[PDB]
Design a protein around this ligand. Structure first.
Ligand code: MG
Length: 74
């Protein structure tokens, strides 16, 4: 399924994912597309800060949901 990850400027990063993909895996996909190291990425959905070891399904993320990406220096 596709999900969207919005950056601070409103850019959409579209990812192809499965419900059993982890947040670690999502950050790896973002690194591959955008070149941003996973350790610099913070993902948020429905007000929750998303933990690397949990899955999309653990957060009830569904097709075409919009996550937010916030970045940190390092
Ligand atoms: Mg896969």
């Amino acid at each position: 399924m596709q999900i969207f990850v919005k950056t601070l400027t409103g850019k959409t990063i579209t990812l192809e994912v499965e419900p059993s993909d982890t947040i670690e895996n999502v950050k790896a996909k973002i690194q591959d597309k955008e070149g941003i190291p996973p350790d610099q990425q913070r993902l948020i959905f429905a007000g929750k800060q998303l933990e690397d070891g949990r899955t999309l399904s653990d957060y009830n993320i569904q097709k075409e949901d919009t996550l937010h990406l916030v970045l940190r220096l390092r």
